[PDB]
Amino acid sequence: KNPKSDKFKVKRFHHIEFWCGDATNVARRFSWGLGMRFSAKSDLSTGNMVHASYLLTSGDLRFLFTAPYSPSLSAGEIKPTTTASIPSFDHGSCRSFFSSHGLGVRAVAIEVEDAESAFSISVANGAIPSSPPIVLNEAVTIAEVKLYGDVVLRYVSYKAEFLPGFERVEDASSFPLDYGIRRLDHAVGNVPELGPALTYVAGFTGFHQFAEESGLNSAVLASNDEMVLLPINEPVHGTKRKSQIQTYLEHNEGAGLQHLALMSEDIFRTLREMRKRSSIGGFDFMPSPPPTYYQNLKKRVGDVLSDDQIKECEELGILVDRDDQGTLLQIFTKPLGDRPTIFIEIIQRVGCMMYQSGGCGGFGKGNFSELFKSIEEYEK
Amino acid sequence: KNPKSDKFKVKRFHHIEFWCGDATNVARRFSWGLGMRFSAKSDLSTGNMVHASYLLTSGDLRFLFTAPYSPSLSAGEIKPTTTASIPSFDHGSCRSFFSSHGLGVRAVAIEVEDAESAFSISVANGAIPSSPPIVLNEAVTIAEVKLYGDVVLRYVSYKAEFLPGFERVEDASSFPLDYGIRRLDHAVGNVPELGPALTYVAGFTGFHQFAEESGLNSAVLASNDEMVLLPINEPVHGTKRKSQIQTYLEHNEGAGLQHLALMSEDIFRTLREMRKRSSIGGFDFMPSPPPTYYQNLKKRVGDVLSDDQIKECEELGILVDRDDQGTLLQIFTKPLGDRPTIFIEIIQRVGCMMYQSGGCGGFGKGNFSELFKSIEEYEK
Ligand SMILES: COc1nc2c(C)cccc2cc1[C@@H](O)[C@@H]1[C@H](O)C=CC(C)(C)[C@H]1O
Ligand SMILES: COc1nc2c(C)cccc2cc1[C@@H](O)[C@@H]1[C@H](O)C=CC(C)(C)[C@H]1O
Ligand SMILES: [Co+2]
Ligand SMILES: [Co+2]
């Protein structure tokens, strides 16, 4: 059931912002590893004396990478006279975030109808304010509330090109890379306590639960059309293998974003291209499942995927799960940076055609059971 | 004249260490951009709970990238029980360095006969101690003294594989990239006052001056065989174009390493390979000189380089200067990170054959005069 209880009008995921120590090197690594093009910048060359911000795009997916300059460059400025293009930015907050958590997601940004109203309604319903609504060049409104840990939910609304003050990148510095990624499908947080996290976030958004022995409990919050999807995990203690969620919390110094799932229009091309680059600056992937996993896959997805399509899944290490409505292809990268914290999922969904409805095929919860039996079966 | 006055036995440049916020992303970007292979690691997977350190190599060139983990991982350790592989590392120093200066060189490391003796003699002759000699696994001794700013001169000596505690990287994660770079030729510092800087460094090393209207004064310190070369620059104030050295000092928050010059065994291959990757994760280069520069080049290097070889220089944007002993091919990257501070020079030297003697062809001081006239000549 979908009660459609959003307390304000939400559209889609808009961008993800990483807080970095050096935005240039992270953005260049991510561009090559994921096939995202350099699209916009706000930095010294655009008159921003406060922070360096580089925007990568692939389809509708927008990754923003931001790092602080020396505060001495802007020591004469006050907020009314700032040259920062993102008015919520703060040198101390950014350095404190990065020293505490390492490289990771600071903001999950969603486009809304009216960011000022979304902020006001959110705070009236329990949201902890992080940055009040600010109107940029009479054109864009941005506001921020706390989501979990030091991650914020960022509201952006447009009266009618990323943000005022950002410049489009010259075509010479913008190479048209594209490995098939098209949008953010979901963004997953790890928290110490799931109950209070859900009550808080669902409390101020009106997002509803989307609904579906390995170390975690989880639930998924969704917007009215279920295109903004926010799974949240908590650890369960007292197993044998210590909770991977607990390990995250330790290395991250608390709650934060665990993974970003990026939808591909052709997951086989995406994974061919990404795997070609793993050892030459790109991203590494988890160990592939045993051959038993794919032998058992014909028995479960033999009617959605041909034997050849299943063979291509085994070449690339792709996992397959199936709902009662749709089928999900997925795979996970190794951690994106030094710490065993954030990583990326690549996904593609097949089914639930009406456009495709959000969450089609679920999130792969069944692949845990299937993987455990594959481990047992391959040992034999 | 070379007085050969080294106060201790110096061999060659050994490695350069960058202090980073995320070593993984910088190392992967540098690997792809420069054609350096992943060679060794010290991190969580090797039992290091303190810092992540990744070593890239190309020929004899060694770049080390290091970032701190959460101090909470090692909160129970003391220096006698540390899991750090580089005992001079300190979480607070590293975070303070990176917050102050951004991404940049922390250590210029030279191999010496006896690092404990080199340290002792250095400090007896004015060097400010940074990290006392420490013997690692009865095999390697490392010690550090201040060089300029927050950059240290690191002494390493071997009784007889990078450092104890580092593991060789598995061949699957180690792709054999190579664009032709073979060693560090020189490392250049920017300081506020050249005189006191030279007196300090020459005072404690015995390094001698190597000797050769655009905003700087400089001098070059050299070891006995002139294979360790350390140019130092100061700004000169009161021009029209404000000193580029002063701009560095402002954006860097003080003295630091300005550029690393990397010798290539084939600068044309190196620049072809590096330029292919500039817009797909690699490094950008300075704007090319006007065609007048290369027209005038035949008149000055027409006897060392054929017309075709000079044409290949113009394709790749390579600069040429000539000593009374040898000829130098050189080119400069744009800054390596967010701040307009550190950058890289690629060089190749021709002449001074005996092996080749250090500094052959100089450092390109004449290319300033030639560039200024090229600007005038091309305007016409
Ligand atoms: C690390 O996350 C995963 N790992 C998997 C592994 C290691 C094997 C097979 C399937 C996996 C699926 C996921 C995830 O996408 C999430 C999680 O499992 C359950 C609910 C969420 C909504 C939070 C999912 O998104
Ligand atoms: C930014 O440095 C340079 N820029 C050049 C430009 C922009 C044009 C032509 C030649 C250049 C040469 C250099 C440098 O290698 C140094 C410097 O000029 C003089 C003495 C040192 C020993 C310190 C050199 O190494
Ligand atoms: Co997922
Ligand atoms: Co130089």
| Residue A214: Cβ within 10 Å count | 13
Query: What was the structure determination method?
Result: X-ray
Dig out the tokens for B116 from the structure: 């404990």
| Contact (Cβ atoms closer than 8 angstroms) between residue A74 and residue A82 | yes
A279 interaction partners in chain B (CB closer than 8 Å): 38, 172-175
**For residue A328, which amino acid is it?**
L
| Residue B310: Cβ within 10 Å count | 18
How many Å separate Cα A226 from the centre of its chain?
16
Resolution as reported, in Å: 1.7
Q: Which residue segments constitute the domains of chain B, with CATH numbers given?
A: 10-173 (3.10.180.10), 181-379 (3.10.180.10)
Task: Report B:243-282 residues touching A (Cβ under 8 A).
Answer: 250-253, 279-282
Adjacent-strand bridge partners of A57 = A37, A62
**For residue A56, which amino acid is it?**
L
Residues 6+ apart with CB under 8 A from A191: A148, A149, A197, A232, A233, A234, A255
Residue A356 is classified by DSSP as B
Instruction: Calculate the alpha carbon distances from A252 to A102, A195, A257, B9, B55 in Å.
Output: 7, 20, 9, 45, 24
B337 interaction partners in chain A (CB closer than 8 Å): 22, 24-25
Is the CB of B289 inside a 6 Å radius of any atom of ligand 2? no
DSSP A89-106: --HHHHHHHHHHH-SEEE
Q: Can you tell me the distance from the alpha carbon of A336 to that of A50, in angstroms, rounded to the nearest whole number?
A: 26
Residues 6+ apart with CB under 8 A from A351: A304, A323, A325, A326, A327, A360, A361
Dig out the tokens for B252 from the structure: 């860097």
Tell whether residue B14 is among the known ligand binding residues: no
Q: Can you tell me the distance from the alpha carbon of A45 to that of B359, in angstroms, rounded to the nearest whole number?
A: 35
Q: Can you tell me the distance from the alpha carbon of A267 to that of A282, in angstroms, rounded to the nearest whole number?
A: 17
**For residue A133, which amino acid is it?**
P
Dig out the tokens for B84 from the structure: 């750090």
Q: Can you tell me the distance from the alpha carbon of A341 to that of A363, in angstroms, rounded to the nearest whole number?
A: 19
Residue A4 is classified by DSSP as -
Backbone angles phi, psi at B42, to 5 degrees: -140, 110
CA distance B360 to chain A (A): 33
Q: Which residue matches tokens 């927050």?
A: B150
Q: Can you tell me the distance from the alpha carbon of B135 to that of A347, in angstroms, rounded to the nearest whole number?
A: 50
Tell which of A30, A98, A274, A279 to mutate to test the B interface (max B CBs under 10 Å): A279
**For residue B354, which amino acid is it?**
M
**Nearest residue on chain B to A21, alpha-carbon basis:** B21
Instruction: Calculate the alpha carbon distances from A68 to A52, B98, B161, B258 in Å.
Output: 6, 11, 37, 20
Residue B265 is classified by DSSP as S
Task: Report B:125-184 residues touching A (Cβ under 8 A).
Answer: 172-175, 177
Helix (H) or strand (E) segment spanning residue B373: helix B366-379
Helix (H) or strand (E) segment spanning residue A273: helix A267-276
**For residue B272, which amino acid is it?**
R
Tell whether residue A186 is among the known ligand binding residues: yes
Residues 6+ apart with CB under 8 A from B161: B40, B168
| Contact (Cβ atoms closer than 8 angstroms) between residue A72 and residue A81 | no
CA distance A78 to chain B (A): 20
Q: Can you tell me the distance from the alpha carbon of B150 to that of B96, in angstroms, rounded to the nearest whole number?
A: 10
Is the CB of B316 inside a 6 Å radius of any atom of ligand 2? no
As a dihedral over the C-alpha atoms of residue A265, residue A271, residue A273, residue A276, rounded to 10 degrees, the angle is 180
Helix (H) or strand (E) segment spanning residue A326: strand A326-332
Dig out the tokens for B292 from the structure: 């007048």
Specify the ligand 1 atom closest to the Cα of A220.
22
Helix (H) or strand (E) segment spanning residue A118: helix A115-124
**Nearest residue on chain B to A20, alpha-carbon basis:** B21
**For residue B142, which amino acid is it?**
I
Q: Can you tell me the distance from the alpha carbon of A19 to that of B209, in angstroms, rounded to the nearest whole number?
A: 44
DSSP B69-86: --GGGGTT--GGG---SS
Specify the ligand 2 atom closest to the Cα of B365.
19
**Nearest residue on chain B to A29, alpha-carbon basis:** B29
Sheet holding A343-351, edge to edge: A208-209, A216-222, A229-235, A181-190, A256-264, A343-351, A326-332, A319-322
Q: What is the Å distance from ligand 1's center to A331 Cα?
A: 10
| Contact (Cβ atoms closer than 8 angstroms) between residue A18 and residue A103 | yes
Q: Report the sign of the C-alpha dihedral through residues A84, A85, A87, A91, in that order.
A: negative
Q: Can you tell me the distance from the alpha carbon of B167 to that of B153, in angstroms, rounded to the nearest whole number?
A: 24
Number of H helices, E strands in chain B: 9, 17
| Residue B92: Cβ within 10 Å count | 10
Tell which of A25, A36, A63, A249 to mutate to test the B interface (max B CBs under 10 Å): A25
Question: Judging by DSSP bridges, how do beta strands B229-235 and B181-190 pair with one another?
Answer: parallel
Dig out the tokens for A29 from the structure: 């690594």
Q: Which residue matches tokens 């073979």?
A: B182
Q: Can you tell me the distance from the alpha carbon of B127 to that of B144, in angstroms, rounded to the nearest whole number?
A: 10
Count how many pairs of residues, chain A against chain B, have C-beta atoms within 8 Å.
Answer: 127
Tell whether residue A15 is among the known ligand binding residues: no
Give the residue among A263, A266, A197 at the shortest CA–CA distance from A230: A197
| B22–A20 CB contact, under 8 Å | yes
| Contact (Cβ atoms closer than 8 angstroms) between residue B245 and residue B235 | yes
| Residue A250: Cβ within 10 Å count | 16
Tell which of A18, A20, A22 to mutate to test the B interface (max B CBs under 10 Å): A22
A26 interaction partners in chain B (CB closer than 8 Å): 22, 25
Q: Can you tell me the distance from the alpha carbon of A157 to that of A162, in angstroms, rounded to the nearest whole number?
A: 11
As a dihedral over the C-alpha atoms of residue B368, residue B371, residue B377, residue B380, rounded to 10 degrees, the angle is -110
Give the residue among B232, B152, B163, B229 at the shortest CA–CA distance from B196: B232
| Contact (Cβ atoms closer than 8 angstroms) between residue A24 and residue A52 | yes
| Contact (Cβ atoms closer than 8 angstroms) between residue B118 and residue B145 | no
A230 alpha carbon, closest ligand: 1
B230-249 core/surface letters (b: 16 or more CB in 10 A; e: else): bbbbbbeeeeeeebebbebb
Helix/strand/coil percentages in chain B, nearest 5: 30, 35, 35
Closest CA to ligand 1's atom 16: A363
B22 interaction partners in chain A (CB closer than 8 Å): 20-22, 26, 102-103, 337-338
Residue A85 is classified by DSSP as S
Q: Can you tell me the distance from the alpha carbon of B46 to that of B83, in angstroms, rounded to the nearest whole number?
A: 9
| A32–B284 CB contact, under 8 Å | no
CA distance B164 to chain A (A): 21
Q: Can you tell me the distance from the alpha carbon of A81 to that of A77, in angstroms, rounded to the nearest whole number?
A: 6
Sheet holding B37-42, edge to edge: B129-136, B140-148, B151-158, B104-112, B10-19, B61-68, B51-58, B37-42, B167-168
Instruction: Calculate the alpha carbon distances from B230 to A255, B198, B202 in Å.
Output: 46, 10, 10
Query: Does the CB of B56 have a partner CB in chain A at under 8 Å?
Result: no
Helix axis angle, B366-379 to B291-301, nearest 10°? 130
